[PDB]
Design a protein around this ligand. Sequence first.
Ligand SMILES: [Mg+2]
Ligand SMILES: [Mg+2]
Ligand SMILES: [Mg+2]
Ligand SMILES: [Mg+2]
Ligand SMILES: [Mg+2]
Ligand SMILES: [Mg+2]
Ligand SMILES: [Mg+2]
Ligand SMILES: [Mg+2]
Ligand SMILES: [Mg+2]
Ligand SMILES: [Mg+2]
Ligand SMILES: [Mg+2]
Ligand SMILES: [Mg+2]
Ligand SMILES: [Mg+2]
Ligand SMILES: [Mg+2]
Ligand SMILES: [Mg+2]
Ligand SMILES: [Mg+2]
Ligand SMILES: [Mg+2]
Ligand SMILES: [Mg+2]
Ligand SMILES: [Mg+2]
Ligand SMILES: [Mg+2]
Ligand SMILES: [Mg+2]
Ligand SMILES: [Mg+2]
Ligand SMILES: [Mg+2]
Ligand SMILES: [Mg+2]
Ligand SMILES: [Mg+2]
Ligand SMILES: [Mg+2]
Ligand SMILES: [Mg+2]
Ligand SMILES: [Mg+2]
Ligand SMILES: [Mg+2]
Ligand SMILES: [Mg+2]
Ligand SMILES: [Mg+2]
Ligand SMILES: [Mg+2]
Ligand SMILES: [Mg+2]
Ligand SMILES: [Mg+2]
Ligand SMILES: [Mg+2]
Ligand SMILES: [Mg+2]
Ligand SMILES: [Mg+2]
Ligand SMILES: [Mg+2]
Ligand SMILES: [Mg+2]
Ligand SMILES: [Mg+2]
Ligand SMILES: [Mg+2]
Ligand SMILES: [Mg+2]
Ligand SMILES: [Mg+2]
Ligand SMILES: [Mg+2]
Ligand SMILES: [Mg+2]
Ligand SMILES: [Mg+2]
Ligand SMILES: [Mg+2]
Ligand SMILES: [Mg+2]
Ligand SMILES: [Mg+2]
Ligand SMILES: [Mg+2]
Ligand SMILES: [Mg+2]
Ligand SMILES: [Mg+2]
Ligand SMILES: [Mg+2]
Ligand SMILES: [Mg+2]
Ligand SMILES: [Mg+2]
Ligand SMILES: [Mg+2]
Ligand SMILES: [Mg+2]
Ligand SMILES: [Mg+2]
Ligand SMILES: [Mg+2]
Ligand SMILES: [Mg+2]
Ligand SMILES: [Mg+2]
Ligand SMILES: [Mg+2]
Ligand SMILES: [Mg+2]
Ligand SMILES: [Mg+2]
Ligand SMILES: [Mg+2]
Ligand SMILES: [Mg+2]
Ligand SMILES: [Mg+2]
Ligand SMILES: [Mg+2]
Ligand SMILES: [Mg+2]
Ligand SMILES: [Mg+2]
Ligand SMILES: [Mg+2]
Ligand SMILES: [Mg+2]
Ligand SMILES: [Mg+2]
Ligand SMILES: [Mg+2]
Ligand SMILES: [Mg+2]
Ligand SMILES: [Mg+2]
Ligand SMILES: [Mg+2]
Ligand SMILES: [Mg+2]
Ligand SMILES: [Mg+2]
Lengths: 147, 210
Amino acid sequence: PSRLRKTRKLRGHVSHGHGRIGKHRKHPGGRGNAGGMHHHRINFDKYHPGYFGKVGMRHYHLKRNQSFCPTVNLDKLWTLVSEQTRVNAAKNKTGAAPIIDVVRSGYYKVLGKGKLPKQPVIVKAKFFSRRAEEKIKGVGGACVLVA
Amino acid sequence: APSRNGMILKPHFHKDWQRRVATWFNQPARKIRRRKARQARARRIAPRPASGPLRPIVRCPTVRYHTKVRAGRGFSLEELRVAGIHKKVARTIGISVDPRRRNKSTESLQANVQRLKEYRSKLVLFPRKPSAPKKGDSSAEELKLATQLTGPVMPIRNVFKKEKARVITEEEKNFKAFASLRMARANARLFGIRAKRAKEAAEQDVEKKK
RNA sequence: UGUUCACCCACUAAUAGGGAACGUGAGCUGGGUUUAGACCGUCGUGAGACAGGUUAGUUUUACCCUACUGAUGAUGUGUUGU
RNA sequence: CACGAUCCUUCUGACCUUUUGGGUUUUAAGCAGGAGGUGUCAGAAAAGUUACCACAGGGAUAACUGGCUUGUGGCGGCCAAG
RNA sequence: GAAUGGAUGAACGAGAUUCCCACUGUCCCUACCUACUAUCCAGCGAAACCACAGCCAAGGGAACGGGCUUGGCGGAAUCAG
RNA sequence: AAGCAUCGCGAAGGCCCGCGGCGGGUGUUGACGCGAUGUGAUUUCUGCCCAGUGCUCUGAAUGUCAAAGUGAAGAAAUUCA
RNA sequence: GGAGCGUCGGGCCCAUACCCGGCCGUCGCCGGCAGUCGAGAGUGGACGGGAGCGGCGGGGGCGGCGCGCGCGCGCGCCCGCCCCCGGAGCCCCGCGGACGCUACGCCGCGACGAGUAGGAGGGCCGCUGCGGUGAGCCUUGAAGCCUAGGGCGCGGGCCCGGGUGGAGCCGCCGCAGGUGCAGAUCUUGGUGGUAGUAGCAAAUAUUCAAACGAGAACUUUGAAGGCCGAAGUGGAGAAGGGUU
RNA sequence: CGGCUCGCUGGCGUGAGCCGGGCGUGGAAUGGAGUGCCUAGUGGGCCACUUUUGGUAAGCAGAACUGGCGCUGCGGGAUGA
RNA sequence: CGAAAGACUAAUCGAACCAUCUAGUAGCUGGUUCCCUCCGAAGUUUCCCUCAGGAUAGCUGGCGCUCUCGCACACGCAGUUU
RNA sequence: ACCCACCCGACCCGUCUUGAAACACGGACCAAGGAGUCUAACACGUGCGCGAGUCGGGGGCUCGCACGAAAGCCGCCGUGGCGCAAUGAAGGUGAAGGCCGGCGCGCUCGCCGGCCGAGGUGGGAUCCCGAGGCCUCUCCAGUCCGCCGAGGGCGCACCACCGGCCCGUCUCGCCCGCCGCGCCGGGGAGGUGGAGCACGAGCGCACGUGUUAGGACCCGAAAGAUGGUGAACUAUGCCUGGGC
RNA sequence: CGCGACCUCAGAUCAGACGUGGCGACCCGCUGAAUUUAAGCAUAUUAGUCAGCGGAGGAGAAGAAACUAACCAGGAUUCCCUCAGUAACGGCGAGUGAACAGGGAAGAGCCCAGCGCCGAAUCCCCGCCCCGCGGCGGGGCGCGGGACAUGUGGCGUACGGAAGACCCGCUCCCCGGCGCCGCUCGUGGGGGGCCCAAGUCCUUCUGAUCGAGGCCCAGCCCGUGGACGGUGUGAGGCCGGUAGCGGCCCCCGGCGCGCCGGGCCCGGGUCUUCCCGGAGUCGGGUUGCUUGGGAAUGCAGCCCAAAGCGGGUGGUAAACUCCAUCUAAGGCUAAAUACCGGCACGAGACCGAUAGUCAACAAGUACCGUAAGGGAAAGUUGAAAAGAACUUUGAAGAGAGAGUUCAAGAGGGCGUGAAACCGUUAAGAGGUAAACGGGUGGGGUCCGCGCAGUCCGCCCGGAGGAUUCAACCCGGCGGCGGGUCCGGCCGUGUCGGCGGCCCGGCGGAUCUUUCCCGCGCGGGGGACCGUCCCCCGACCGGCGACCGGCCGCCGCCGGGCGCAUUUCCA
Ligand SMILES: [Mg+2]
Ligand SMILES: [Mg+2]
Ligand SMILES: [Mg+2]
Ligand SMILES: [Mg+2]
Ligand SMILES: [Mg+2]
Ligand SMILES: [Mg+2]
Ligand SMILES: [Mg+2]
Ligand SMILES: [Mg+2]
Ligand SMILES: [Mg+2]
Ligand SMILES: [Mg+2]
Ligand SMILES: [Mg+2]
Ligand SMILES: [Mg+2]
Ligand SMILES: [Mg+2]
Ligand SMILES: [Mg+2]
Ligand SMILES: [Mg+2]
Ligand SMILES: [Mg+2]
Ligand SMILES: [Mg+2]
Ligand SMILES: [Mg+2]
Ligand SMILES: [Mg+2]
Ligand SMILES: [Mg+2]
Ligand SMILES: [Mg+2]
Ligand SMILES: [Mg+2]
Ligand SMILES: [Mg+2]
Ligand SMILES: [Mg+2]
Ligand SMILES: [Mg+2]
Ligand SMILES: [Mg+2]
Ligand SMILES: [Mg+2]
Ligand SMILES: [Mg+2]
Ligand SMILES: [Mg+2]
Ligand SMILES: [Mg+2]
Ligand SMILES: [Mg+2]
Ligand SMILES: [Mg+2]
Ligand SMILES: [Mg+2]
Ligand SMILES: [Mg+2]
Ligand SMILES: [Mg+2]
Ligand SMILES: [Mg+2]
Ligand SMILES: [Mg+2]
Ligand SMILES: [Mg+2]
Ligand SMILES: [Mg+2]
Ligand SMILES: [Mg+2]
Ligand SMILES: [Mg+2]
Ligand SMILES: [Mg+2]
Ligand SMILES: [Mg+2]
Ligand SMILES: [Mg+2]
Ligand SMILES: [Mg+2]
Ligand SMILES: [Mg+2]
Ligand SMILES: [Mg+2]
Ligand SMILES: [Mg+2]
Ligand SMILES: [Mg+2]
Ligand SMILES: [Mg+2]
Ligand SMILES: [Mg+2]
Ligand SMILES: [Mg+2]
Ligand SMILES: [Mg+2]
Ligand SMILES: [Mg+2]
Ligand SMILES: [Mg+2]
Ligand SMILES: [Mg+2]
Ligand SMILES: [Mg+2]
Ligand SMILES: [Mg+2]
Ligand SMILES: [Mg+2]
Ligand SMILES: [Mg+2]
Ligand SMILES: [Mg+2]
Ligand SMILES: [Mg+2]
Ligand SMILES: [Mg+2]
Ligand SMILES: [Mg+2]
Ligand SMILES: [Mg+2]
Ligand SMILES: [Mg+2]
Ligand SMILES: [Mg+2]
Ligand SMILES: [Mg+2]
Ligand SMILES: [Mg+2]
Ligand SMILES: [Mg+2]
Ligand SMILES: [Mg+2]
Ligand SMILES: [Mg+2]
Ligand SMILES: [Mg+2]
Ligand SMILES: [Mg+2]
Ligand SMILES: [Mg+2]
Ligand SMILES: [Mg+2]
Ligand SMILES: [Mg+2]
Ligand SMILES: [Mg+2]
Ligand SMILES: [Mg+2]
């Protein structure tokens, strides 16, 4: 909608909202990210601290699928399974504890955020955090490593 | 000239990009053209599967995909050999055959064999003439279907095995997983130098004798 | 002497001083400054430089308005002349 | 008051990390602190000339006039030692 | 200041100066004459330039106004200059 | 411009062209020639300066001086000679 | 004998300032109104027993919290009632509620209103095209154009009358943009003033008659006077032109 | 006021931090406050009172303070930032 | 190409013309199109091969939110003063 | 609104400028054209849909497309993007705490049972409780309805502060673990770096403003490069003619 | 000094073939800038980009791993999404910048050299016959030539292959012709041709209607046809068309059957014995360019220059070592993909003659330039030419009458005909250039009036005329509202039926393989849980979700009511 834009209101007015002292000249700064080190220095070093300079190790032929390791927090571990596993348990009276294969639902690591409900679980995962393990043990469960 | 906070961003419009803009007003006509072509091929290959040939079950590479399973390119030669299908002939009955696939694990092999077995069972080989010789199926299984198979022939569904709620033996409770991983990590890390120290120690024991 | 300025001769009553966009280039002139050519000296490795000297080097338009100069005319006085 | 960022280099530091299919060793790359300098000192690597000259602009800026000023120049008083 | 040539030098030069003789309107100091114009008419017929325009004095003003302030004043339409 | 004076070159050469060629110009030429500079007829002269910047001559007697080649240690990249 | 100067009076003169009033807009009001009592608001109403001229016998406070239009009252007759707006008749009405109420509406009180650069809001301002919509308009005359006609709007603008013209065009709700000009020594086209002006002045020169012809300064013929003056204004070619 | 905590500090005590109670207008005058995002234009200025540096001075150059003009008309100062 | 003037090379020469790259780049000139309404600046900061430009603060506008109570029943803030 | 008169006011616009009626520039006059666009990327604001998700592409299935190159649908619905987790150069690591009882010497350290479960201070719109009034035509009783409400509470969002947790890093220290007892692995206390957690707020779409990259509001160089055309002028050489 | 083989080389207007140029949107191979950005600039960037040269095709190129990876592994190329503005490059500044995996579009795989076996078993050209001949082919027959052992053909190529012995099971595939049958998806493939519904019906406007009103149901008729165009305005039905698994006629394609001529004796597994790979190439150094590729991604020149349990790769130089992974130095290959040139079509929220292409027109035209090159302007009478016969003035151009046309106030550059500018006619003014703002006045132009504008509307009182009713009941119809929820339909929350539950389905990582079927898994039952539906009773919100009676009210019609009522009129 041109109808709604500004330039429609500016018809008539001479400078077109760019002022008549300094004009709308073509490229007064320098084009683009020119002057990061000279003359636009303040902008770059109070809104992009750390832009300039190297750091860390190069790594030439990086491939992201090697380092693929999505995470799930205990917070919502039971969300992986249908409610009626969590229900048929806190029931049953065998002291069974259902299995939660985390890798099936698309997470490899089981990190430790959150309260787990007092209800035993076997959790199958690729990796665990220390605290995430400890929590499951305290609930009355068992961590299970899987390849 | 930048103004008070933003992403210091680098657009790639410094080459003559407007010379090489590729619009997409085709796409509808394209989709139609593809679908017309597809419908033609189906009509040509009369009772054959429109899909194309039957293709092997295959695991994806890399730790990421790993757990999934795809269609592959074609059945390996070892797989065909086990099924009892001559490699040159398989291509004429609608079995894909690559010969570049190795075959590492027995688990992948047998499942693929099972596939070809299944296919041969549920396939209706028309005889070369209408006057029937061996192999060619009965005129019953022929009249009842000279039908195409819409969609991929014997589709792959990446499937899981349910586990019954166990009880957790005391030993299982006992497992120190996090710790276990860390140890294992360090053993991998240190395996090589440990081995070197052992070799040094053995040399010192032998050197003591002489 | 391009000069302004200066000086000297001569006359004179006196050879006072100034201004007007340092009056006055569609008034002239262009001798001088102040393009391009060239010469000399000094300076510069050099290209080149020189309120240092020298010579050669295109000076456009008015029919508009006004101003001024002259030239017909104008309103009035009934018309016309004296 | 007596001093210097990124990048690069160099030295020092830890039974440190990485050096990519795995392992040993050189090498290299990291991490942290010094040093090698930017005096145009918040930090390009840089000589002239143009009268053969050019372009964008500038009365934000010179070379006239005209304004203000009047030191300087010119002209004129007061006082009165001579 | 010596082939970055010094010094000379007959002949020559649409070259640069100085003086003399002659000659002259260069001048004193201007005048008269001729042709072609300009001038008037018939016919034909452009252009540049143009914010609006077009009398002055002083004032103030971006510090020299046609316009503003205060005064002077102002009379159609035009011709050659 | 004649005149004067320097300089290079005896041809697998001087000077020069050309993207390239067992290419081409001088050259259908050979030092009384070709090429590169200065000065500028004649006359009369043409002083001193080789420190500077140029040019040039000589060269195991010799400081430095690259790539290769030669030796050196190293497991090798290598480093050192 | 100020229309001068210094000191001082009264009186009067007028700014877009100040005061009062109108009207427009903006801002603000926990602003008001989907239908109700109520103006320093400081209650209203069951309902039960006991009773009645009783009451709640509290400050020169000068008073607000209590008093003189009734509480009980006139009627039916000490006892009963003290009744219903489909009817009290109404200044308050709680039974139902605007002429008003497109709630993006309507209404009320205050205050305030310079503005470049710049920002924001609203435009039933305007242009062209699309989805909808107006049982829209139009040869019984569309667009456009013109108008010393009549009006509206603060304004952008708009509507009507008359004329001209001769085929299409508009209102509303949405969407979309190559959407609004005084300038750019702007671009293209057109027209002025200048102006019947400058001008049609290089190389000596024309004159008389007749003819033709609508028409002769200029054509043609004749006569005369002139020039070019064989390095020609003569007679032939080259190149170039291309039918002259 | 009452009590707890301390790895600080220390003859005992400090000092801080925590709980639990007890107490209300604490000079004048004025006004509703607080808070967060996006953000254009601007970054040539000039002038006057008073102060003030350079300069003989300047309608000069340069600072301070406030107010102006710039962005702003209107009455007056004839005329006028 | 030049008996040398930077001369000449199709009215063009201190680097011809024609087309393209090309809408070359411009901190610099010029221009930049309807109405009303409300608010309404700056020429100062530090940094910059910065001084006819940017950056950054400042000054402006817009959007808001959180609370406050003239609904007899207020806390906090100020180009003052005490 | 057409013309004319008179009094008062009144300099020509645009523009750069501290300052323009300027002896600053552009502008004779009229018509038509004529300059903030589109794409991409980001940011913040706003509207809508869904919400720990969201998403639509790309593809596919439904038609000869009249309207359709639409519309609809898809275990593709999610490969995948963005989000739901950070922090470290990296190897890696990765957000919980409290309380109670017991057992180890409660050793502000280590291990075993039960309960609560995202901490606390101040301030917080707002809810909640509410002594008490304040009347009712009488003296008391007395449920119902309000109005106000002193006083007390739970306290959103948000802010300030203090604790806590995660990752890096240092300092100090004492214990645990086992298929591999090791230059192994795991913890503790106290500082300190982090674009962290501390009962989620995103994703998609649309519109606006701003900032960029692009011809990038419009017009404007002197230049630079690539590839071609010219010696009909003129410069110089040569060939062949002519002339004095 | 002969004649004859071959080898290497010549010449032919020898016989018969091919190549040459164009086009150039897309494609392949070179070559290759500079404006530009970095606020300067040189590396970088612009950019392997414009220009330059070469060569193609309907596509090209690429392509069947000397590949990815490091997994439980994938498996030619190309294309899209994503990876990702990421890893990386970079005066680590400006800026640049991929790949693998994953999901799709498509999908197709092969052949040599060598090593070997087979009497060269092969090829080309002659010449005679039969067929076939507008893409020169088949079959036969020739002591007819040549090519070829310096290696043609069959088998065979890394997925292994060959040759042997016995295990098994059995024998259709191709082409040259000649016929003939079913016309074979936009729903009869392609092309061509010719065809196919319904008003010119009644009135009436008009210059002319395709307009306006009507026509057995918005009117008649057709409608699988109401797209578009044409026709004197606006047309489903006037005409062409449009619709239709409509018709007919030609031709051509493509596939189905028959006959002939040829070719063709073409398997698989199992055990044994043999067989095996492309050199001035890899690899190294190097210099130059190139890349995201960083102690060298790719391509080059030069120098060096290999091996065979080798060689290559395994994204940090090197040595040692294990692993993995391919097999290089020969070749072919459809498909999805590209397409501002071409031929032929379709469409548009585009432009509408200063726009849109330079070009709506006799435009790459006229014209300019020596040449390379530059490069315009320019659409519209009217329905129909009916384009003005004739008279008259004039040498004529030009007029005046006359005429055509609805109109020439449409007259051949003619639709509409703005402004600037000019002529005239009318009105008004005029010594401070004009013009302007505020305020009045004077004059004009038209516009509204009034030949009283006393403007209307209620109600009332009076005096005149006027018809019929209000009021009241009676009969009918319709509407409103109401509660008794009275009776029944209707639905919210709750409870009862466990009743739909199998006669109620989906979903579930809940269970069971006691089940069934197909091969521990898939599909289906069978339990279970969640969710959605029947039966009746009770309570409650009795809800605009409705009916039936009854009530009350309102309205309309029709009866009665004749005049102290009832409206009308002045
Ligand atoms: Mg403005
Ligand atoms: Mg702006
Ligand atoms: Mg401007
Ligand atoms: Mg600016
Ligand atoms: Mg400025
Ligand atoms: Mg497919
Ligand atoms: Mg002068
Ligand atoms: Mg003069
Ligand atoms: Mg002159
Ligand atoms: Mg002179
Ligand atoms: Mg000179
Ligand atoms: Mg004259
Ligand atoms: Mg290795
Ligand atoms: Mg000179
Ligand atoms: Mg000079
Ligand atoms: Mg200039
Ligand atoms: Mg100046
Ligand atoms: Mg002066
Ligand atoms: Mg000398
Ligand atoms: Mg000398
Ligand atoms: Mg003037
Ligand atoms: Mg010499
Ligand atoms: Mg000498
Ligand atoms: Mg020397
Ligand atoms: Mg205002
Ligand atoms: Mg017409
Ligand atoms: Mg448009
Ligand atoms: Mg204009
Ligand atoms: Mg004349
Ligand atoms: Mg003569
Ligand atoms: Mg002749
Ligand atoms: Mg002649
Ligand atoms: Mg100054
Ligand atoms: Mg200004
Ligand atoms: Mg010169
Ligand atoms: Mg531009
Ligand atoms: Mg600048
Ligand atoms: Mg300027
Ligand atoms: Mg001005
Ligand atoms: Mg002036
Ligand atoms: Mg200027
Ligand atoms: Mg001008
Ligand atoms: Mg216009
Ligand atoms: Mg948003
Ligand atoms: Mg921003
Ligand atoms: Mg832009
Ligand atoms: Mg340009
Ligand atoms: Mg350059
Ligand atoms: Mg060709
Ligand atoms: Mg630059
Ligand atoms: Mg620049
Ligand atoms: Mg530059
Ligand atoms: Mg590049
Ligand atoms: Mg090219
Ligand atoms: Mg190909
Ligand atoms: Mg190959
Ligand atoms: Mg791939
Ligand atoms: Mg991403
Ligand atoms: Mg690049
Ligand atoms: Mg062979
Ligand atoms: Mg028609
Ligand atoms: Mg029609
Ligand atoms: Mg028909
Ligand atoms: Mg590069
Ligand atoms: Mg490595
Ligand atoms: Mg190929
Ligand atoms: Mg046109
Ligand atoms: Mg035209
Ligand atoms: Mg055109
Ligand atoms: Mg037109
Ligand atoms: Mg035209
Ligand atoms: Mg026309
Ligand atoms: Mg026209
Ligand atoms: Mg007409
Ligand atoms: Mg007409
Ligand atoms: Mg027309
Ligand atoms: Mg016309
Ligand atoms: Mg007129
Ligand atoms: Mg008159």
